[PDB]
Amino acid sequence: TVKKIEPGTAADSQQIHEEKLLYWNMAVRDFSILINLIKVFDSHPVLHVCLKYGRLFVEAFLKQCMPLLDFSFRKHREDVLSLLETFQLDTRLLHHLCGHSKIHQDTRLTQHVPLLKKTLELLVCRVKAMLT
DNA sequence: AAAAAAAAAAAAAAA
DNA sequence: TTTTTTTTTTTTTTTT
């Protein structure tokens, strides 16, 4: 479902802008609570399918969300700052999940860590870019 | 203690 | 002639 949402235009109207950004908001809040259910659960298939699909989730966040961050920035400043503080808490949580992958030394979990790490560096440097 | 499911690696085929 | 993607197999881990 997160593959489906496309970035519109800067010349797109305010209503479509606000509805798709609140759609992104409930998407990232569902991602955050889906990360929060992992801290009590075990059985490396679980954390492995997490490290699989959360990666392409943040790839969807790269390819579909940040053009909307580029288009609607000047007017919806409070909305995009709420979205970035919503994403920063799951950024630190994904840092914790990759650290949890390193401290257990599993061959299945250690495949999908460094791609997610370099996409974390890409998203934080793009946060620095949209801060400008 | 055995069976099933899932993932990863290797092979093969197509552009 | 070379690279990528899909399919199949094998192993490992979890459950009954």
Short mmCIF file of C-alpha atoms (C1' of nucleotides) in Angstrom, two decimals:
data_model
loop_
_atom_site.label_atom_id
_atom_site.label_comp_id
_atom_site.label_asym_id
_atom_site.label_seq_id
_atom_site.Cartn_x
_atom_site.Cartn_y
_atom_site.Cartn_z
CA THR A 1 0.00 0.00 0.00
CA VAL A 2 2.93 2.40 0.61
CA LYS A 3 4.13 1.68 -2.97
CA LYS A 4 0.80 3.11 -4.30
CA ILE A 5 1.03 6.76 -3.06
CA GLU A 6 2.56 8.94 -5.82
CA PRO A 7 4.06 12.44 -5.45
CA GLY A 8 1.83 15.11 -7.09
CA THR A 9 3.00 18.61 -8.16
CA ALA A 10 3.94 21.89 -6.43
CA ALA A 11 1.04 23.43 -8.48
CA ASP A 12 -1.33 20.78 -6.92
CA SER A 13 -4.15 22.29 -4.79
CA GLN A 14 -3.93 22.58 -0.96
CA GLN A 15 -6.68 19.99 -0.24
CA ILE A 16 -5.03 17.06 -2.11
CA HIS A 17 -1.71 18.16 -0.48
CA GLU A 18 -3.10 18.05 3.09
CA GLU A 19 -5.03 14.75 2.64
CA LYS A 20 -2.04 12.85 1.16
CA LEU A 21 0.34 14.27 3.82
CA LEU A 22 -2.04 13.12 6.61
CA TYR A 23 -2.16 9.76 4.75
CA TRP A 24 1.68 9.72 4.98
CA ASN A 25 1.27 10.68 8.68
CA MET A 26 -0.97 7.68 9.50
CA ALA A 27 1.40 5.51 7.36
CA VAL A 28 4.49 6.52 9.39
CA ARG A 29 2.54 6.20 12.70
CA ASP A 30 1.52 2.64 11.66
CA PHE A 31 5.21 1.99 10.82
CA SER A 32 6.23 3.31 14.28
CA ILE A 33 3.73 1.11 16.21
CA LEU A 34 4.68 -1.88 13.99
CA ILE A 35 8.30 -1.21 15.15
CA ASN A 36 7.08 -0.86 18.79
CA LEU A 37 5.54 -4.41 18.77
CA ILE A 38 9.03 -5.96 18.05
CA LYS A 39 10.73 -5.14 21.43
CA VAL A 40 8.75 -7.93 23.25
CA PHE A 41 8.89 -10.56 20.42
CA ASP A 42 11.71 -12.92 19.34
CA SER A 43 12.20 -15.89 16.89
CA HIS A 44 14.62 -14.48 14.24
CA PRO A 45 12.15 -15.00 11.31
CA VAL A 46 10.18 -12.08 12.92
CA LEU A 47 13.11 -9.62 13.11
CA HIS A 48 14.35 -10.95 9.72
CA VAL A 49 11.05 -10.18 7.89
CA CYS A 50 11.15 -6.80 9.73
CA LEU A 51 14.65 -6.05 8.34
CA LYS A 52 13.40 -7.21 4.90
CA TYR A 53 10.16 -5.20 4.46
CA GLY A 54 10.87 -2.08 6.59
CA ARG A 55 13.83 -1.50 4.23
CA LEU A 56 11.59 -1.28 1.11
CA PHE A 57 9.16 0.78 3.27
CA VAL A 58 11.87 3.44 3.76
CA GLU A 59 12.74 3.06 0.03
CA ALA A 60 9.07 4.01 -0.66
CA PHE A 61 9.62 6.91 1.79
CA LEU A 62 12.62 7.99 -0.36
CA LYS A 63 11.01 7.67 -3.81
CA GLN A 64 7.41 8.87 -3.08
CA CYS A 65 7.38 11.08 0.10
CA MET A 66 10.41 13.42 -0.25
CA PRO A 67 9.17 14.96 -3.57
CA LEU A 68 6.01 15.93 -1.60
CA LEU A 69 8.36 17.30 1.10
CA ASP A 70 10.06 19.29 -1.72
CA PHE A 71 6.77 20.57 -3.20
CA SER A 72 4.81 21.47 -0.01
CA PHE A 73 7.49 22.97 2.33
CA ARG A 74 6.91 26.78 2.45
CA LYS A 75 3.18 26.64 3.45
CA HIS A 76 2.84 23.34 5.43
CA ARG A 77 5.92 23.86 7.67
CA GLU A 78 4.28 22.64 10.93
CA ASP A 79 2.97 19.51 9.11
CA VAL A 80 6.37 18.54 7.61
CA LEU A 81 8.18 19.23 10.94
CA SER A 82 5.62 16.98 12.72
CA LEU A 83 6.32 14.34 10.01
CA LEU A 84 10.13 14.67 10.45
CA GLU A 85 9.93 14.35 14.27
CA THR A 86 7.58 11.36 13.68
CA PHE A 87 10.25 9.79 11.42
CA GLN A 88 13.25 10.65 13.68
CA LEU A 89 11.93 8.52 16.60
CA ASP A 90 11.62 5.45 14.30
CA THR A 91 15.04 6.41 12.78
CA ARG A 92 16.62 6.02 16.26
CA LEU A 93 14.48 2.87 16.75
CA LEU A 94 15.81 1.40 13.44
CA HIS A 95 19.32 2.31 14.71
CA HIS A 96 18.41 0.20 17.80
CA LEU A 97 17.12 -2.69 15.58
CA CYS A 98 20.33 -2.74 13.48
CA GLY A 99 22.35 -2.60 16.75
CA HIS A 100 20.23 -5.53 18.02
CA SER A 101 21.17 -7.31 14.73
CA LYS A 102 24.92 -6.64 15.36
CA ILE A 103 24.96 -7.72 19.06
CA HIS A 104 23.37 -11.18 18.29
CA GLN A 105 25.74 -12.02 15.31
CA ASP A 106 23.16 -13.74 13.00
CA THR A 107 24.07 -14.42 9.32
CA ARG A 108 20.44 -13.91 8.13
CA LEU A 109 19.93 -10.51 9.91
CA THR A 110 23.44 -9.16 8.96
CA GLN A 111 22.63 -9.26 5.17
CA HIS A 112 19.99 -6.44 5.23
CA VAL A 113 21.68 -4.09 7.81
CA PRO A 114 24.21 -2.01 5.72
CA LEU A 115 21.75 -1.13 2.89
CA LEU A 116 19.30 0.10 5.57
CA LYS A 117 22.24 1.96 7.23
CA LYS A 118 23.24 3.81 4.03
CA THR A 119 19.54 4.66 3.40
CA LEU A 120 19.46 6.02 7.02
CA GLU A 121 22.48 8.23 6.11
CA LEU A 122 20.66 9.27 2.87
CA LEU A 123 17.44 10.18 4.75
CA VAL A 124 19.26 12.15 7.51
CA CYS A 125 21.41 14.11 4.97
CA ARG A 126 18.20 14.80 2.99
CA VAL A 127 16.64 16.07 6.29
CA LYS A 128 19.68 18.42 6.47
CA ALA A 129 19.00 19.37 2.79
CA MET A 130 15.30 20.26 3.38
CA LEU A 131 16.40 22.16 6.54
CA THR A 132 18.12 24.51 3.99
"C1'" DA B 1 12.79 -36.46 18.22
"C1'" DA B 2 10.83 -35.66 13.82
"C1'" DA B 3 8.51 -32.81 10.50
"C1'" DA B 4 7.42 -28.54 8.25
"C1'" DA B 5 8.30 -23.93 6.67
"C1'" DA B 6 11.20 -20.28 5.19
"C1'" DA B 7 15.24 -18.26 3.51
"C1'" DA B 8 19.56 -18.18 1.01
"C1'" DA B 9 22.61 -19.77 -2.48
"C1'" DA B 10 23.40 -21.68 -6.88
"C1'" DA B 11 22.01 -22.73 -11.57
"C1'" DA B 12 19.90 -21.57 -15.82
"C1'" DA B 13 17.87 -18.75 -19.20
"C1'" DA B 14 16.94 -14.35 -21.52
"C1'" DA B 15 18.17 -9.71 -23.22
"C1'" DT C 1 29.68 -12.59 -24.89
"C1'" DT C 2 28.05 -10.81 -20.33
"C1'" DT C 3 24.77 -9.77 -16.65
"C1'" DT C 4 20.49 -10.17 -14.18
"C1'" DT C 5 16.46 -12.43 -12.54
"C1'" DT C 6 13.76 -16.31 -11.36
"C1'" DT C 7 13.25 -20.90 -9.82
"C1'" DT C 8 14.70 -24.78 -7.38
"C1'" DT C 9 17.08 -27.06 -3.72
"C1'" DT C 10 19.10 -27.53 0.71
"C1'" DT C 11 19.76 -26.33 5.28
"C1'" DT C 12 18.39 -24.55 9.63
"C1'" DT C 13 15.24 -23.38 13.01
"C1'" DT C 14 10.96 -23.78 15.32
"C1'" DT C 15 6.93 -26.38 16.74
"C1'" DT C 16 4.18 -30.45 18.00
#
